[PDB]
């Protein structure tokens, strides 16, 4: 089997991509937040704090005859952001892009945090990290692709963000007319349960590639680029008036300035992102001071290629006995 959804910028700024998800019988379509780092599906539902509801669509299992109590089983989690959510969880049949799921964990929210609330775009997230990341107790329960990964044509699923329009997250195969060149794959770590490899290094706009190991993870619900602070300042240097504002909370720069591109290093494959995916715009409206993309991980205790970084590129993840990742320009 194979699935293909088409998934859609929420916001003039690409902060986050939703893909429309169909839940229980018959169909409750909700647009769920694809993750590679996370592991949890969870949805807006009949359960959730009534005020902590404004704007999304929600899933009521209750209205779903394939929906089952998951007895005893209880959720909750902390993003990397600070936001949060927890409840309970059903068993329900779950399809994306015409791949279908039966008896797929579907975490119904019982609370959620301010920032999900106040985001009525996003109905919930559908998590594509390691399953060891779940966070079902007493028993972990398996993501929508560790469930469909048997059933598909090849153990994989792509990544094709598109910038400022949307793009395609494939199941179960390859579409190798959505690429330009050829894939080059590289090493995976599942230790911490992420999608976690290590770039060969990087350049800023037409400057000299420096060859560096810059461990990171591929995570889709990341909107920006964090990375090492010394890589961070050697592109900011590049952008006059750009500086990083600890009241704002990262790098700024000039409204009025032309952003470098930014290459990164896969193999001996190189991947460029053009200096307009690093513009996050004005840091509040009418503000001539603008959000870089890029931004230091420093505090954070990981690198994250987001969203800034795999929009640029087609991305595999190759979920076979050895994981594998792999990035196409395109």
Same mark, same amino acid.
């Given at each position: 089997?194979?699935?293909?959804?088409?998934?859609?910028?929420?916001?003039?700024?690409?902060?986050?991509?939703?893909?429309?998800?169909?839940?229980?019988?018959?169909?409750?379509?909700?647009?769920?937040?694809?993750?590679?780092?996370?592991?949890?599906?969870?949805?807006?539902?009949?359960?959730?704090?009534?005020?902590?509801?404004?704007?999304?669509?929600?899933?009521?299992?209750?209205?779903?005859?394939?929906?089952?109590?998951?007895?005893?089983?209880?959720?909750?989690?902390?993003?990397?952001?600070?936001?949060?959510?927890?409840?309970?969880?059903?068993?329900? %049949?779950?399809?994306?892009?015409?791949?279908?799921?039966?008896?797929?964990?579907?975490?119904?929210?019982?609370?959620?945090?301010?920032?999900?609330?106040?985001?009525?775009?996003?109905?919930?997230?559908?998590?594509?990290?390691?399953? %060891?990341?779940?966070?079902?107790?007493?028993?972990?329960?398996?993501?929508?692709?560790?469930?469909?990964?048997?059933?598909?044509?090849?153990?994989?699923?792509?990544?094709?963000?598109?910038?400022?329009?949307?793009?395609?997250?494939n199941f179960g195969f390859i579409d190798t007319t959505a690429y330009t060149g050829s894939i080059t794959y590289t090493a995976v770590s599942t230790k911490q349960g992420f999608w976690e490899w290590t770039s060969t290094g990087y350049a800023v706009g037409s400057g000299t590639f420096k060859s560096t190991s810059i461990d990171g993870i591929a995570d889709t619900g990341t909107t920006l680029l964090y990375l090492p602070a010394t890589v961070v300042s050697a592109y900011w240097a590049q952008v006059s008036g750009a500086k990083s504002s600890s009241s704002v909370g990262g790098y700024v720069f000039p409204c009025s300035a032309t952003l470098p591109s930014f290459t990164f290093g896969v193999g001996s494959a190189r991947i460029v992102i053009p200096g307009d995916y690093i513009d996050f715009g004005p840091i509040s409206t009418g503000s001539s001071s603008c959000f870089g993309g890029i931004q230091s991980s420093a505090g954070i205790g990981i690198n994250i290629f987001g969203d800034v970084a795999l929009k640029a590129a087609f991305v595999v993840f190759n979920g076979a006995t050895t994981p594998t990742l792999g990035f196409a320009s395109k």
């Open positions: 089997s194979t699935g293909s959804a088409t998934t859609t910028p929420i916001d003039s700024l690409d902060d986050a991509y939703i893909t429309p998800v169909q839940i229980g019988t018959p169909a409750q379509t909700l647009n769920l937040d694809f993750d590679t780092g996370s592991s949890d599906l969870w949805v807006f539902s009949s359960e959730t704090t009534a005020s902590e509801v404004d704007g999304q669509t929600i899933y009521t299992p209750s209205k779903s005859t394939t929906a089952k109590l998951l007895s005893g089983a209880t959720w909750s989690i902390s993003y990397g952001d600070g936001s949060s959510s927890s409840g309970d969880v059903y068993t329900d %049949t779950v399809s994306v892009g015409g791949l279908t799921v039966t008896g797929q964990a579907v975490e119904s929210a019982k609370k959620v945090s301010s920032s999900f609330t106040e985001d009525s775009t996003i109905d919930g997230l559908l998590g594509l990290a390691f399953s %060891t990341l779940n966070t079902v107790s007493p028993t972990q329960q398996k993501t929508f692709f560790d469930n469909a990964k048997a059933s598909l044509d090849s153990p994989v699923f792509t990544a094709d963000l598109g910038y400022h329009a949307p793009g395609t997250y």
